[PDB]
Amino acid sequence: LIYGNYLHLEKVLNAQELQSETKGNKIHDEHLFIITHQAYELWFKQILWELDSVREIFQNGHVRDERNMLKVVSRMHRVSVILKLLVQQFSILETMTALDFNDFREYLSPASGFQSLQFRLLENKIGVLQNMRVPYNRRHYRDNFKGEENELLLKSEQEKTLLELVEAWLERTPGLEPHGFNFWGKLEKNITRGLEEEFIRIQAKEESEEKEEQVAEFQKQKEVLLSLFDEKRHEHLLSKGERRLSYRALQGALMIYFYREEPRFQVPFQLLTSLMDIDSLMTKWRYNHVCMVHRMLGSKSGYHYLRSTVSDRYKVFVDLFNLSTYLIPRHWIPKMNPTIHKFLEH
Amino acid sequence: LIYGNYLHLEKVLNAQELQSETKGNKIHDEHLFIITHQAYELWFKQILWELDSVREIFQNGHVRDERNMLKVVSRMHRVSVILKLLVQQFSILETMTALDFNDFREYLSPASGFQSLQFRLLENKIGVLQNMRVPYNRRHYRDNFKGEENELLLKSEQEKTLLELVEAWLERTPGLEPHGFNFWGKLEKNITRGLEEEFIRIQAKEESEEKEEQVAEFQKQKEVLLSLFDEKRHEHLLSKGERRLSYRALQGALMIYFYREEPRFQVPFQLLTSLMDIDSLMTKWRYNHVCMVHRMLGSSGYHYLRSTVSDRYKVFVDLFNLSTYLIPRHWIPKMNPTIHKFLEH
Amino acid sequence: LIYGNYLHLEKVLNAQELQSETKGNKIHDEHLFIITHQAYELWFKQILWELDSVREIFQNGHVRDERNMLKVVSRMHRVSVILKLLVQQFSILETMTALDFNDFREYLSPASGFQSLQFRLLENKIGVLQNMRVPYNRRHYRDNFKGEENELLLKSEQEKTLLELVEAWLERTPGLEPHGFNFWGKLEKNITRGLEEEFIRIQAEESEEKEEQVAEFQKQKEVLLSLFDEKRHEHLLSKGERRLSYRALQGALMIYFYREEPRFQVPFQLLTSLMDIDSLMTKWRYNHVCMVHRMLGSSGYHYLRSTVSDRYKVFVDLFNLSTYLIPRHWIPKMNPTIHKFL
Amino acid sequence: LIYGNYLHLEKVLNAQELQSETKGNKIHDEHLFIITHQAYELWFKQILWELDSVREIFQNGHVRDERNMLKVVSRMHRVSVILKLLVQQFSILETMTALDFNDFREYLSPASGFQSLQFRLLENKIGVLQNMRVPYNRRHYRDNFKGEENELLLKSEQEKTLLELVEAWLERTPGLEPHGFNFWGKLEKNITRGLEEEFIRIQAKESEEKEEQVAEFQKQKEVLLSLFDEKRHEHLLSKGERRLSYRALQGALMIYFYREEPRFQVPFQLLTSLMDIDSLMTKWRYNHVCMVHRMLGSGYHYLRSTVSDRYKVFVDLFNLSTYLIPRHWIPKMNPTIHKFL
Ligand code: HEM
Ligand code: HEM
Ligand code: HEM
Ligand code: HEM
Ligand SMILES: Fc1ccc2c(-c3ccc4nnn(CCN5CCNCC5)c4c3)c[nH]c2c1
Ligand SMILES: Fc1ccc2c(-c3ccc4nnn(CCN5CCNCC5)c4c3)c[nH]c2c1
Ligand SMILES: Fc1ccc2c(-c3ccc4nnn(CCN5CCNCC5)c4c3)c[nH]c2c1
Ligand SMILES: Fc1ccc2c(-c3ccc4nnn(CCN5CCNCC5)c4c3)c[nH]c2c1
Ligand SMILES: C[C@](N)(Cc1c[nH]c2ccccc12)C(=O)O
Ligand SMILES: C[C@](N)(Cc1c[nH]c2ccccc12)C(=O)O
Ligand SMILES: C[C@](N)(Cc1c[nH]c2ccccc12)C(=O)O
Ligand SMILES: C[C@](N)(Cc1c[nH]c2ccccc12)C(=O)O
């Protein structure tokens, strides 16, 4: 067993055919463009491998055994460490000038990155919605794909996504039981009370621009906080695709946020953090890719379509980010005395 | 022409065979170990491509046309930007624990990174000298290689290296002509004079320990500076492999250092800078690789690898060491436009 | 001379007062928020130092001596290396959760990053135009400032910007002389010819492929010939959608196309670095936005989002020269006979 | 409350005095040298803040409540994220050439980085031992310091270090009870047995490969059984080739092997981050060395000496890789017997 055989370098290092050279006009920088993409694809394959393994742990019920949370968080962390490198890797392609790219661009048409099967598979498996995908020149993405490739794409759309598997798991989060710790009920009450207290305070002040300013802020804060308990408004925002998680999953997430220090919630909290990281880094990748298309082609547009992809429309875990909106004073958080805490001890 | 076909992904993405899985005991993290190395190898191929192209520009005489310096510096800069990423890429493999590596390590024997053809090609093409290589288990690196692989490795040793091609170019550096600007002559004189000036200054100082200290410093500095003009000392240090550039090439390098702002030397100065960067980053790569072997295998190969993290493997150590011979600006032989013109484009 | 004294650490390391602690409720992570910003400010001061030195080299005429180009490009490169680090530095503040930030946010009012004098000075000195700024809360940015600070900000708007100083230098680029190499004239002719030649080719099959190629030719011709429309340029200048004078634009394109010619090698690197600085400034604004979102939720967020736009790209014209790339063989030939001038 | 006042920028941004300018020969690049160091010092202060807060959580007994492990690991992770940036920050000073540094170097004498109080405080608070310090010609690293500065340095050496506080905590790791899961006993037995089983295998082999395997076996056997030699450990402790008590070492290995068990998941991450901090500290030392070399040529060798295991405080955690065994040799922890975890 030799290194080169183990790594099948007979394949990996015999995969560089410059179209410029095939058409009798070799252009040096084409080689860089080929290798950069091959490297992106190697790492996309590794991301798919980690992500598929984590999806499986959820789908098959292994995640139910909390012994497996360390593995889940390590692999999701690994996904983000890979993505950070993928973002840095753009700096290599920045060493190619547009004038140099212009010397071989002709020999590439009509190929495009759009045809990256694995990038699409990755978007789908995380949880990007087709309905929300931005049309490129009034066209569907899968239009450019055929055969078994079109097949794999379909499975990726139809199989349970990371978002859905996390949703299901969040729905079973301990503490939501109305007959138990009754998190949601206690939270509603504590916030309603606290708002009442606060209003009384402000109402006791004397008419002024200040008082109005405080009253106005209060009203805004009140509306945001109480909207959390409006299950119907949530259902509505779900159907418009401005939210992604079920109402119950949202309750589980908030439970984990507020009780993160409780032992059973420590690693779950880290998982939520890494899911947000993955969304952020995916968006950073899209951003750096856009900046590059611009530098090479100008405003001539793919640039604008790609710019549209840099939006909340492509953020699968938007709901986890938006739990910042619902931050309250610590003393309003339902108290969990050891009496009612033992259920969250390893 | 479709993306996947253009990039031959039918090969690149059908090259991942976990030996753990082939022997009926798939271990998840083996997949990462394979991909990481495949990625290193893709980028080694790219470095070889740039490096070979720059070597050719020198070997074929194209570098004589100063129009080509921009291309040479961009490609060498590109080599160092790739190497920066190769160093960061270790952080991916740091997400694998030793315990998890231990579950598939058995299925890897007897394969090793040592058998990386391209890493050897890269060391050779830059200019690592065989005689200065540290033996691993009392053997040449080029054993463990056979057939056309052994062939490629030979060519890489026998063809002109980047070190040799740079040396040749440095020897032709403008300004070294005794009949012209006579840089070396003027430099020797100006330093001899400046040292004299300095001695007088210190000798004037009131008897005091500071004076005593400064006397000591002066003596050391004087010895270092004058040793520059000792061509025989240089020949000796060449034999011991503590220097690699010819005496004349060293003169050319120092010319470019001191006159870097002069238009014809601006991009050449950047080239020298990038050559040092490449050596720095190669040794950072070796260092990070060692730290990783340690974390996975504990404290043999470790010690061999530790020996690789040394000036013995820095091809352009001479460019770094020109810091030793820095002088006050006012000692640098003057180049008024009168004697400037030869360095304007 | 001792390290601590040389670096005036008696000041730098006695500058951390947690407002949470001053009001009797110390919150651990406030310390990090203070240090992060102090570090950003140290680096902004260094950027200002390099940038002011480069502006001086232009304004005083030193740049006319081409021996100074290495210094100019090194310092501009150094600006972008600093900015790369400023972008990475956000990852430190990402270790603070929103819940933890929430515990000391109250004690910060009414202070904001908006009030960073140095950040504004930097925007102004590069060449961000006030009239092109996005209003904050329906008002001008400088209204948030007072006294000598408001005055410094004005000088920064009125004194020559890096954009203006580069523009002047670009205007004197060798080769534009109609009586000389006549770059613009030759270029117009060669593109007119080359377009025709393309037509002749495309004139010959009737497939959609042909139709597609014909379609491309149309815009390509439109884009390329629009380059020679000086009036359209003047119009886009007044709307602020371009920044450089028509002549400066000619100089830049001269440098792009002839970058390998010795006199243009380091100038080409300067143009590259100016684009880098714009790109990295934008990356900084982007990462800052992503972080405000993570800490505050969904709004300054929307104002900040508006700053991530071409409106704030001072050297947009250098980026846009990609639009006007032609085949190499169309580029006016400069044989050594004439190449000697460069 | 205004930004500049909140951040006391009247101090931070009025702290840049170029000695080149003070002596009538301003050198542009000196400004960068000053700011770079000031930035390093701001971040060293932040590292000290996090590290001191973590040391407190151990010393005051809060670490006993496992609810606090998330905070402990977050702050140690934060230390590493800062150090990663400190390593990247060298790339800024690499934009200064040695020729340009040479134009103001004279005006610095005799000041040196050696005089960084905070860097010393950081080394000490982690657990770098004075007795293990590499002498700089005349030793006396603390002798470069005086006054309340010399005072602070002393406290930093004498107060409990991160190493010592972690050691104490590792000693209380659940599972080491002889009357309980009896980790050490079971481990010794399982390895002794497994080695015997291996002997039979190699015995049944029948040329060279056998020779190869037998040789390896002997080495592996020696390494593994040396783990159970408490006296050898005590000896290596007194030399300074190990740092953790024998019992702490047992706790660490418990956490390594049972990392997936819920009570050990975050503790395992803590051990990982302690190793990370050691790694990154030594990366910092390495990049600093490479730069002194580029600027001065030939402290290079002294600084090179600092890049050694001699300066790795958590060397014991790294070295537990040496004692990896097959998974099936690890004492089994059935639900019944992992209830405690
Ligand atoms: C010279 C550098 C690059 C240029 C000029 C470029 C150009 C483009 C353009 C114009 C598009 C929009 C679709 C189209 O018009 O055909 C696009 C999309 C895409 N490119 Fe690139 N690209 C570059 C580098 C890369 C790299 C390094 C990757 C890495 C795999 C990549 C992957 C993609 C992907 C996946 C898409 C589809 C993204 C989406 O639809 O959201 N490209 N590229
Ligand atoms: C788990 C991670 C790794 C381990 C444990 C490891 C182990 C080793 C060891 C022990 C050696 C010395 C030769 C021997 O006895 O086998 C070696 C050398 C080498 N490794 Fe690695 N390695 C790792 C990762 C990598 C990676 C990511 C690369 C990337 C290509 C690589 C490339 C090499 C090369 C080229 C050599 C020969 C270097 C020289 O002779 O100076 N290794 N490795
Ligand atoms: C918790 C972290 C941060 C939050 C929540 C935050 C929040 C904000 C907000 C809301 C604004 C809009 C103005 C306002 O309404 O106050 C703003 C602007 C700004 N922040 Fe931050 N910021 C953070 C970190 C930073 C840091 C680390 C810097 C570093 C110097 C910074 C510099 C600025 C600057 C310069 C502006 C003005 C930007 C412009 O107008 O284009 N901020 N920030
Ligand atoms: C031009 C760049 C630098 C040079 C030439 C330089 C030079 C040196 C030298 C020669 C030493 C050994 C002690 C001595 O002989 O004085 C040293 C130690 C030290 N330097 Fe630097 N240094 C540089 C940059 C930095 C930076 C950026 C830091 C960041 C704070 C720093 C912090 C230190 C520290 C803490 C030590 C003592 C560490 C130890 O003893 O292991 N230096 N430096
Ligand atoms: F393997 C690859 C191959 C090509 C690319 C590109 C890319 C970037 C800029 C381009 N300008 N023209 N073309 C030709 C393609 N036509 C433009 C619109 N889309 C399809 C028709 C381009 C292709 C980006 N990544 C690639 C990967
Ligand atoms: F494609 C690959 C495959 C394997 C590696 C290794 C590597 C790392 C640690 C190891 N421990 N045992 N073995 C296997 C046997 N070795 C033979 C050479 N002398 C050391 C023992 C190892 C192989 C590093 N890079 C690789 C790349
Ligand atoms: F040195 C510093 C000090 C503070 C900050 C902030 C920041 C971040 C979030 C905030 N939420 N409320 N406030 C108070 C500011 N008022 C409301 C928002 N508009 C301005 C008036 C905030 C201030 C960001 N960077 C800072 C740096
Ligand atoms: F705030 C600061 C000030 C200075 C430094 C240095 C530094 C780097 C190179 C030097 N060469 N000579 N000197 C003067 C000091 N003498 C030689 C070295 N040992 C002590 C006597 C130097 C000082 C590094 N970091 C610094 C920080
Ligand atoms: C038994 C369980 N693992 C419980 C569970 C669900 N979601 C959680 C989030 C945090 C902590 C625990 C849970 C399961 O049902 O998967
Ligand atoms: C014409 C030339 N390339 C001169 C030359 C050689 N080395 C240099 C370094 C810097 C500047 C110029 C040169 C030659 O003789 O090859
Ligand atoms: C003499 C000159 N340096 C000419 C000049 C202007 N812009 C340029 C761009 C590239 C090369 C040269 C120039 C000057 O007038 O500044
Ligand atoms: C009660 C205890 N937290 C026990 C303890 C010590 N070390 C550990 C490691 C992992 C898990 C638990 C421990 C204490 O006394 O610290």
**Encoding tokens for residue D301?**
């060798």
The rounded Cα B188 to chain-centroid distance in angstroms is 29
Best CA proximity match to B42, nearest among B110, B89, B96 = B89
Question: Using an 8 Å Cβ cutoff, are D161 and D124 in contact?
Answer: yes
If you take atom 14 of ligand 11, which residue's CA is the nearest one?
C64
Q: Quote the ligand 10 centre to B169 CA distance (angstroms).
A: 6
Separation CA C287–CA C293 (nearest Å):
10
| Burial grade of B41 (CB within 10 A; 0-12, 13-18, 19 or more) | buried
Least distant ligand from the CA of A91: 1
In chain A, what residues touch C286 (CB-CB under 8 Å)?
Answer: 287
Query: How many domains does chain A contain in total?
Result: 1
Question: What is the three-state SS of B21-61?
Answer: HHCCCCCCCHHHHHHHHHHHHHHHHHHHHHHHHHHHHHHCC
Q: Quote the ligand 6 centre to B98 CA distance (angstroms).
A: 13
- The most distant pair of C-alpha atoms in chain A lies apart, rounded to whole Å, by 85
D112 touches chain C (CB under 8 A): yes
Distances (CA, A) of A150 to A124, A146, A281, B6, B122: 13, 5, 27, 19, 41
Enumerate residues 70 to 109 of chain C having a beta carbon within 8 A of any beta carbon in chain A: 98-99, 102-103
Separation CA A143–CA A72 (nearest Å):
34
In chain C, what residues touch D276 (CB-CB under 8 Å)?
Answer: none
Best CA proximity match to A325, nearest among C287, C99, C113, C306 = C99
Ligand 7 atom with the shortest distance to the CA of C296: 9
Question: What is the three-state SS of chain A?
Answer: CCHHHHCCHHHHCCCCCCHHHHCCCCCCCHHHHHHHHHHHHHHHHHHHHHHHHHHHHHHCCHHHCHHHHHHHHHHHHHHHHHHHHHHHCHHHHCCCCHHHHCCCHHHCCCCCHHHCHHHHHHHHHHCCCHHHCCCCCCCCCHHHCCCHHHHHHHHHHHCCCHHHHHHHHHHCCCCCCCCCCCHHHHHHHHHHHHHHHHHHHHHHCCCCHHHHHHHHHHHHHHHHHHHCCCHHHHHHHHHCCCCCCCHHHHHHHHHHHHCCCCHHHHHHHHHHHHHHHHHHHHHHHHHHHHHHHHHHHCCCCHHHHHHHHCCHHHCCCHHHHHHHHHCCCHHHCCCCCHHHCHHHCC
Q: Ligand 9 in contact with A66 (CB < 6 A)?
A: yes
C137 touches chain D (CB under 8 A): no
Contact C260 B345 (CB under 8 A): no
Best CA proximity match to C228, nearest among C198, C196, C194, C185 = C185
* Ligand 10 pocket, residues with Cβ under 6 angstroms: B 64, 66, 169, 172-174, 256, 264-265, 268
Separation CA B62–CA C198 (nearest Å):
33
Separation CA C35–CA D42 (nearest Å):
6
Question: Using an 8 Å Cβ cutoff, are D56 and D257 in contact?
Answer: no
Minimal CA separation from D103 to chain A, in Å: 32
Helix (H, G, I), strand (E, B) or coil at C139: strand
Question: Among C32, C89, C113, whose Cβ lies nearest the Cβ of D3?
Answer: C113
Separation CA C170–CA C160 (nearest Å):
15
Distances (CA, A) of D220 to B98, C307, D185, D189, D214: 17, 62, 19, 16, 10
Least distant ligand from the CA of B175: 10
Question: Using an 8 Å Cβ cutoff, are C311 and C282 in contact?
Answer: no
Separation CA A4–CA B116 (nearest Å):
7
Separation CA A41–CA B13 (nearest Å):
8
Rg (CA), chain C: 25
Separation CA D279–CA D79 (nearest Å):
12
Q: What are phi and psi of C136, to 5 degrees?
A: -95, 125
> How crowded is the C-beta side of B19, counted as CA atoms within 13 Å?
19
Q: Quote the ligand 8 centre to D100 CA distance (angstroms).
A: 15
| Beta-carbon contacts of residue D282 (< 8 Å; ≥ 6 apart) | D307, D311, D312
Within a domain: B207? no
Question: Using an 8 Å Cβ cutoff, are D263 and D234 in contact?
Answer: no
Contact C115 D3 (CB under 8 A): yes
If you take atom 39 of ligand 2, which residue's CA is the nearest one?
B114
Within a domain: D138? yes
Q: Ligand 8 in contact with D235 (CB < 6 A)?
A: no
Dihedral sign for Cα atoms in the order A45, A49, A52, A58? negative
Please report the resolution in angstroms.
2.5
Contact A346 D266 (CB under 8 A): no
Q: Quote the ligand 3 centre to A100 CA distance (angstroms).
A: 39
Ligand 8: which of C5, C6, C9 to mutate, judged by most atoms within 8 Å of the beta carbon?
C6
Separation CA D35–CA C50 (nearest Å):
12
| Beta-carbon contacts of residue B45 (< 8 Å; ≥ 6 apart) | A13, A16, A35, B118
Question: Using an 8 Å Cβ cutoff, are A70 and D260 in contact?
Answer: yes
C285 touches chain A (CB under 8 A): no
Eight-class DSSP state of D161: P
Minimal CA separation from B78 to chain D, in Å: 16
Q: What is the CATH number of the domain that holds B262?
A: 1.20.58.480
Eight-class DSSP state of D181: T
Within a domain: B191? no
Rg (CA), chain B: 25
In chain D, what residues touch B283 (CB-CB under 8 Å)?
Answer: 290
Contact D318 B295 (CB under 8 A): yes
Least distant ligand from the CA of C17: 7
- C160 residue type, one letter: K
Separation CA C267–CA C69 (nearest Å):
7
Element containing residue C166 per DSSP (H, E): helix C162-171
| Beta-carbon contacts of residue C178 (< 8 Å; ≥ 6 apart) | C184, C185
How would you classify residue B217: left for phi > 0, otherwise alpha for psi between -120 and 50, otherwise beta? alpha
Secondary structure (DSSP) of C52-115: HHHHHHHHTTGGGSGGGHHHHHHHHHHHHHHHHHHHHTHHHHTTS-HHHHTTTGGGGTT--GGG
The rounded Cα A19 to chain-centroid distance in angstroms is 36
Neighbours of D188 (CB within 10 A): 16
Closest-approach residue (CA) in chain A for D68: A261
In chain C, what residues touch A300 (CB-CB under 8 Å)?
Answer: 219, 223, 323
Question: Using an 8 Å Cβ cutoff, are D48 and D116 in contact?
Answer: no
CA angle, C260 as apex, C255 and C266 as ends, to 5°? 65
Within a domain: D321? yes
Distances (CA, A) of D234 to A306, B290, C85, D237, D244: 63, 29, 46, 5, 10
Q: How many CB pairs under 8 A join B and C?
A: 35
Question: Using an 8 Å Cβ cutoff, are A256 and A272 in contact?
Answer: yes
Question: Using N-to-C axis directions, what is the helix angle for C117-126 and C147-158, rounded to 10°?
Answer: 10
Rg (CA), chain D: 25
Dihedral sign for Cα atoms in the order A178, A181, A182, A184? negative
Q: Quote the ligand 5 centre to A111 CA distance (angstroms).
A: 5
How would you classify residue A140: left for phi > 0, otherwise alpha for psi between -120 and 50, otherwise beta? beta
Within a domain: D212? no
Helices (H) and strands (E) in chain D, counts: 18, 0
Minimal CA separation from D89 to chain C, in Å: 7
Separation CA A158–CA A137 (nearest Å):
25
Separation CA A54–CA B91 (nearest Å):
21
Separation CA B271–CA B281 (nearest Å):
15
**Encoding tokens for residue C95?**
């270790």
**Encoding tokens for residue B283?**
């040794």
Separation CA B86–CA B84 (nearest Å):
5
Question: What is the three-state SS of D287-312?
Answer: HHHHHHHHHHCCCHHHHHHHCCHHHC
Enumerate residues 208 to 237 of chain C having a beta carbon within 8 A of any beta carbon in chain D: none
Ligand 11 atom with the shortest distance to the CA of C172: 6
Within a domain: D229? no
Question: Using an 8 Å Cβ cutoff, are B125 and B156 in contact?
Answer: yes
Separation CA C240–CA D73 (nearest Å):
51
In chain C, what residues touch B68 (CB-CB under 8 Å)?
Answer: 260
Neighbours of C75 (CB within 10 A): 20
Separation CA D48–CA D122 (nearest Å):
6
Q: What are phi and psi of C139, to 5 degrees?
A: -155, 160
Q: Quote the ligand 1 centre to A114 CA distance (angstroms).
A: 6
C291 touches chain D (CB under 8 A): no
Neighbours of C76 (CB within 10 A): 21
Question: What is the three-state SS of chain B?
Answer: CCHHHHCCHHHHCCCCCCHHHHCCCCCCCHHHHHHHHHHHHHHHHHHHHHHHHHHHHHHCCHHHCHHHHHHHHHHHHHHHHHHHHHHHCHHHHCCCCHHHHCCCHHHHCCCCHHHCHHHHHHHHHHCCCHHHCCCCCCCCCCCCCCHHHHHHHHHHHHCCCHHHHHHHHHHCCCCCCCCCCCHHHHHHHHHHHHHHHHHHHHHHCCCCHHHHHHHHHHHHHHHHHHHCCCHHHHHHHHHCCCCCCCHHHHHHHHHHHHCCCCHHHHHHHHHHHHHHHHHHHHHHHHHHHHHHHHHHHCCCHHHHHHHHCCHHHCCCHHHHHHHHHCCCHHHCCCCCHHHHHHHCC
Question: Using an 8 Å Cβ cutoff, are C99 and C77 in contact?
Answer: no
Dihedral sign for Cα atoms in the order D215, D218, D220, D222? negative
Best CA proximity match to B41, nearest among A15, C162, A332, A164 = A15
Rg (CA), chain A: 25
C246 touches chain A (CB under 8 A): no
Give the technique used to solve this structure: X-ray
Place of tokens 């309250």: A328
Q: Ligand 3 in contact with C97 (CB < 6 A)?
A: no
| Beta-carbon contacts of residue D340 (< 8 Å; ≥ 6 apart) | D174, D175, D180, D181, D263
The rounded Cα A111 to chain-centroid distance in angstroms is 28
Element containing residue C231 per DSSP (H, E): helix C230-238
Question: Using an 8 Å Cβ cutoff, are A326 and A221 in contact?
Answer: no
**Encoding tokens for residue C126?**
């590069």
- B266 residue type, one letter: Q
Within a domain: B37? yes
B261 touches chain C (CB under 8 A): yes
Minimal CA separation from A230 to chain D, in Å: 32
Best CA proximity match to B322, nearest among B235, B243, B220 = B243
Within a domain: A54? yes
Best CA proximity match to B43, nearest among A18, A12, C166, D18 = A12
Question: Using an 8 Å Cβ cutoff, are D277 and D263 in contact?
Answer: no
In chain B, what residues touch A122 (CB-CB under 8 Å)?
Answer: none
Contact A37 B7 (CB under 8 A): yes
Neighbours of C197 (CB within 10 A): 11
Eight-class DSSP state of C333: P
Place of tokens 């005799």: D110
Dihedral sign for Cα atoms in the order D292, D293, D297, D300? positive
Altogether, the residues listed in chain B come to a count of 345
Neighbours of C136 (CB within 10 A): 17
Question: Using an 8 Å Cβ cutoff, are C44 and C118 in contact?
Answer: yes
Separation CA A38–CA B41 (nearest Å):
11
In chain B, what residues touch C70 (CB-CB under 8 Å)?
Answer: 260-261, 266, 269
Q: What are phi and psi of B100, to 5 degrees?
A: -80, -35
Domain range for residue C106? 8-177+240-339
